Amino acid sequence: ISNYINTIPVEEQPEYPGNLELERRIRSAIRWNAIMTVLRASKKDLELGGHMASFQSSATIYDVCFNHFFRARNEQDGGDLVYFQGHISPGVYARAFLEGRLTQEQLDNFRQEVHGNGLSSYPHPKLMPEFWQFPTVSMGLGPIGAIYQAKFLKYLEHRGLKDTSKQTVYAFLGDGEMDEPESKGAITIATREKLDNLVFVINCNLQRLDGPVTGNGKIINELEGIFEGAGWNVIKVMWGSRWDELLRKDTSGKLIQLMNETVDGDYQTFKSKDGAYVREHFFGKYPETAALVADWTDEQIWALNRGGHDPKKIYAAFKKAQETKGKATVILAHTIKGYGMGDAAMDGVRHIRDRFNVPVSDADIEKLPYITFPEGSEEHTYLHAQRQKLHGYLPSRQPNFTEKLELPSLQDFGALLEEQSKEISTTIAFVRALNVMLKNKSIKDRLVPIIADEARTFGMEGLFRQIGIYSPEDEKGQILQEGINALGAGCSWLAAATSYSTNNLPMIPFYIYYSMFGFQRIGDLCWAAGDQQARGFLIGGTSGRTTLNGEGLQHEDGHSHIQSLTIPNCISYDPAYAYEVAVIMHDGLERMYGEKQENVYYYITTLNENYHMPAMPEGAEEGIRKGIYKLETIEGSKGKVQLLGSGSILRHVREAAEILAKDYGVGSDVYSVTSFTELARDGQDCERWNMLHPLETPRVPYIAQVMNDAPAVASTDYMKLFAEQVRTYVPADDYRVLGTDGFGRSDSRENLRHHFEVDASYVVVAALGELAKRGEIDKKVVADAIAKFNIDADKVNPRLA
C-alpha cells in the first residue's frame, strides 16, 4: 500500500493524444442522450427502471477508451473483449445511437423488448445477438469470467489456433461489486498465468447502492493491498491535474499525509459541502496544508477533482496497462458517484443541460430531445475517425461462425454402438466418444477437454499422454486442468464454448466434473452461459444419488437434472448405455457445430458404475435423441405394464421386468428414457399449440406416441419429479414414479437403492400395486411381494430420513 496519490506522477505522464475540448463536446452529448433515454422510459410510468448515476461517474473512463484504446472486431481478431459494467448500458446505447448504430425509435423502446424493436436493460446477447457480447449484471461473474477469457486467448495463441496477441480483455467493475467472493477469489490466477492481456478497471466512487463500500476504511487501499499481494500491477488514478502544482509544492509532505489519513466517509462528506467547508475541514487540518490554499479562491478549491474524471490521468493508466508485460493490471479509478447531477445525484434537466453545456435550447428541453451530430460537423468527423482508426465499432457480435466443419459421422462412433465385451460405464463411453472426435481431422484440435483437478476419477488419465496438459505438460498441451475450482473451469468452458462468436473460431469444450458441483455450485454461470449462447458440453460425472455410493450427502446427486431443466437452452440427457452416449454426443455436435448452428449447450450425466453394455437396437437413433424408445417387450399372460428407466437405474427396471414375467405372469413394455426433460418440453409444446389452435386436430406428444395405455412405473437415480414431469403426457391412467428424494448418505449401491426405494423389488411392488387397483390380481399378492422382498413398509420416507 502506497501513498494515496496517483501511481503515475505527472513527470511520467505521456502527452494526451486527443482534442480534449472536442472529445468533451461529444461526451456531453452521450451523457445527455443516456439520461434522456432513462427519463423518457420513466415518463411511461411502467416501472421500467434504468440507471443514470453510475454511467455519469464513469463516462470519461469509457470515453478515453473509445477514443484511444478499444479495438473493434476485425479481419485478424475479435478485437478487445469488453465486459462493460451492466448498469452503464444507457451510456453504451447513447454512444451507439450517436455513431448512428441505433435509431431513435430503439432508444425510445429502452427496456421494452417484447414487440421486437427495443433495447435490453443490460448486456444480454440472447436478447440482442448482434450487439452485446458478455453478460455482466450478475455482479462478480464478469471479473472471473474475464480472467478465464484472457487465459483462453493465451491458450488459443499457444495452441497455434489463432494469433490473439493484439487482443486485450477489459473488465469494468464497481468497487461495491468487489465484495462478491468471485470478484477477487480468482485473481492469483492472472498472476500464475501471466495474463498481460487482462485489465481490471474498478470504478471507485467509494459508493455501492445503499451506501459506501466501507465508510470507516479506505476501500481503495484494501483493493490495492490485495491485488498487489496477488502479484498484480496496480495503477491508482486518484486526483485530477489541478492537484499537480499543489503536490510539487507541499514540501512538508503534510498534504500527502493528510490525503493518507482521511477516510472514505469523510471524502464523501467533502463531496457535498463546498470550497469553504473544504479549505477549513480538509486543507485546514494543518498549517502547511492550509497554507497551500490559504491564498486560493474558494471556488478554485471546489474545482479540485478526482483522477477518474480527468482524461489525462485516465489515458496514462490505460497506456501504462497496455505496455505492461508479465502480469495483469488493475486500474483503481477514483470518481464521483452521480457526478454533475447536483440536486438528485424540468429544473433538474435544466441543471444538467447547463452543467455539461449541452446543445439543447430552452425551447426544446421539455421534449427531452436526443442530440445528433450531422455529417460534416467537427464532432461527427472526430467521433468516427477515432473509431475507424480502431477498426470500427463495439460492442457488436457475430452470431454464427463462418467456416464449415467436417464433423464425424455417427458411423465413426461405430464401436460404441455395438455390444461391449468388457463391462464399462457411460463415463468410459464418453471418454471413448472423445477419442473418436480426436481422430477427426476437422475438429481434433478444436476440442477443449476441461477438468477440475480430478482426472483419474473420471478415467481421463489416458488422454493426458495423447494430447497433453496445457501448461505455459507444456504450452501446446490441449487439456485444460483448472485444479479444485468449479467456477473457474466453468469460466474456461464458457470462453471456449463462445469462441465461435467471439473470435469466429469454433472450439468444442467438454467439461467433466462431479455432477453435484455443477448447476448447484455454478448455476448462476450456467444461466449466464445460456444468455451468452454457449455451445458446448457439460458432463456431470459420478452422477445419480445411489451410484456414487460411498461419498454421501454433499456428493450424491439426485437432482442436477431438476436444476438443469430450468435453463431454456440447455439440452439434458441421463443415458443408461454406451450407444446412447454415442448417439447423443453425435447429435449435439451436429446441432451446435454443424450447419444448423443451434444455440444450445448439452448436459449429459455419466456414471462410475460398470455393467454390461448391449448393442443399440436398429432404428433407435431418433428415439434416443428424442428422449425415449421401447427396448423390449416381455410376454406374460396374467397382466401387462410399462416400465420406464433411465441412467444406472434402467438396469434394475429391466430386472423387475423379468421378475414380473417369471414370478407373476405379468408382461411388459420396457422403455429406456434418455431424457425425461426433453420429453416434458415436447409435451408442453404440444399442449401449448393445441390450446392456441382449438379448431385443429390435437397434436400428440412424442412420449404418448411411443407409449401405450397399460399401467406404467418409472424409476431413476433422481428425485421423483424428474420422471413425474411427463405425467400429463403419459397416455396411461396409472403412472407410478419411484425416485431418490432425500439426502444421500454413505453405503453400498445395493443398500442405497433399497433405502431410496428405487431398486428392482420396489419397481415390482409398484407394478403389482397398479394391477391390483385395477383388479387383475388380488391385493394379497402385492402384500406378499412386500414380505417376500423383505421390504420395510413402515420405514421413514427417504425424503425425511
Q: Which residues are annotated as a binding site for Mg(2+)?
A: 175, 205, 207
Residue 216 vs 421, nearer CB to Mg ion: 216
Residue 196 vs 310, nearer CB to a second copy: 196
Shortest Å distance, C-beta 62 to a second copy: 21
Question: CB of 593 within 8 A of CB of 506?
Answer: yes
Backbone dihedral angles phi then psi of residue 708, each to the nearest 5 degrees: -120, -165
Residue 73 vs 755, nearer CB to a second copy: 755
Angle at 441 between CA 439 and CA 442, to 5 degrees: 125
Residue 387, SS3? helix
Question: CB of 132 within 8 A of CB of 475?
Answer: no
Residue 393 vs 735, nearer CB to a second copy: 735
Shortest Å distance, C-beta 148 to Mg ion: 23
The DSSP-derived string for 583-594 is: HHHHHHHHHHHS
Query: Measured over all CA atoms, what is the biggest interatomic distance in the chain, rounded to whole angstroms?
Result: 108
Contact mark string toward Mg ion, 751..780, x via CB under 5 A:
------------------------------
532: contact with Mg ion by CB under 5 A: no
From Mg ion, a second copy, none, interface partner of 205 (C-beta below 5 to 8 A by class): Mg ion
Residue 736, SS3? strand
From a second copy, Mg ion, none, interface partner of 619 (C-beta below 5 to 8 A by class): none
Positive or negative torsion for Cα 759, 763, 766, 772 = negative
CA 792 to the chain's CA centroid: 45
Residue 174 vs 509, nearer CB to Mg ion: 174
Shortest Å distance, C-beta 174 to Mg ion: 3
Task: List binding-site positions.
Answer: 175, 205, 207
Residues numbered 250-279 forming contacts with Mg ion, rule: CB under 5 A: none
From Mg ion, a second copy, none, interface partner of 732 (C-beta below 5 to 8 A by class): none
Shortest Å distance, C-beta 56 to a second copy: 19
From Mg ion, a second copy, none, interface partner of 786 (C-beta below 5 to 8 A by class): a second copy
Shortest Å distance, C-beta 499 to a second copy: 22
Q: Which position has the grid cell 490485495?
A: 226
Shortest Å distance, C-beta 66 to Mg ion: 20
From a second copy, Mg ion, none, interface partner of 735 (C-beta below 5 to 8 A by class): a second copy
* Region of residue 647 (phi > 0: left; psi between -120 and 50: alpha; otherwise: beta): left
β partners of residue 207? 212
CA 572 to the chain's CA centroid: 18
Amino acid at 178: M
Shortest Å distance, C-beta 119 to a second copy: 8
Contact mark string toward Mg ion, 182..211, x via CB under 5 A:
---------------------x-x-x----
> Which of 125, 135, 176, 683 is the binder for Mg ion (CB under 5 A)?
176
Kindly indicate which of the ranges 176-184, 188-196, 426-434, 643-651 contains the residues binding Mg ion, using the contact rule CB under 5 A.
Answer: 176-184
From Mg ion, a second copy, none, interface partner of 367 (C-beta below 5 to 8 A by class): none
Question: CB of 120 within 8 A of CB of 89?
Answer: yes
Shortest Å distance, C-beta 417 to a second copy: 28
Residue 108 vs 244, nearer CB to a second copy: 108
Q: Residue 628 is placed in which grid cell? A: 425415449
Q: Where are the alpha helices (DSSP H) in 400-460?
A: 414-417, 426-437
Residue 22 vs 48, nearer CB to a second copy: 48
Residue 363 vs 692, nearer CB to a second copy: 692
From Mg ion, a second copy, none, interface partner of 288 (C-beta below 5 to 8 A by class): none
Residues numbered 155-174 forming contacts with Mg ion, rule: CB under 5 A: 174
From Mg ion, a second copy, none, interface partner of 203 (C-beta below 5 to 8 A by class): Mg ion
Question: CB of 686 within 8 A of CB of 730?
Answer: no
Backbone dihedral angles phi then psi of residue 3, each to the nearest 5 degrees: -60, 155
Shortest Å distance, C-beta 320 to Mg ion: 22
β partners of residue 479? 469
Residue 174 vs 575, nearer CB to Mg ion: 174
From a second copy, Mg ion, none, interface partner of 488 (C-beta below 5 to 8 A by class): a second copy
β partners of residue 713? 643, 736
Strand 628-634, strand 666-673: pairing: antiparallel
CA 60 to the chain's CA centroid: 28
Position of minimal CB gap to Mg ion: 174
Using CB under 5 A as the binding criterion, the count of chain residues that bind Mg ion stands at: 6
Angle between helices 141-158 and 486-497 (to 10 degrees): 60
Residues numbered 293-352 forming contacts with Mg ion, rule: CB under 5 A: none
Shortest Å distance, C-beta 745 to Mg ion: 26
Residue 308 vs 530, nearer CB to a second copy: 530
Note every long-range contact of 158-163, with CB atoms under 8 Å and residues 24 or more positions apart, other chains counting.
158/470, 158/472, 158/475, 158/476, 159/445, 159/470, 159/476, 159/478, 160/476, 161/445, 161/446, 161/505, 161/507, 162/77, 162/503, 162/505, 163/76, 163/77
Positive or negative torsion for Cα 728, 732, 734, 737 = negative
| Residues in contact with Mg ion by the rule CB under 5 A | 174-176, 203, 205, 207
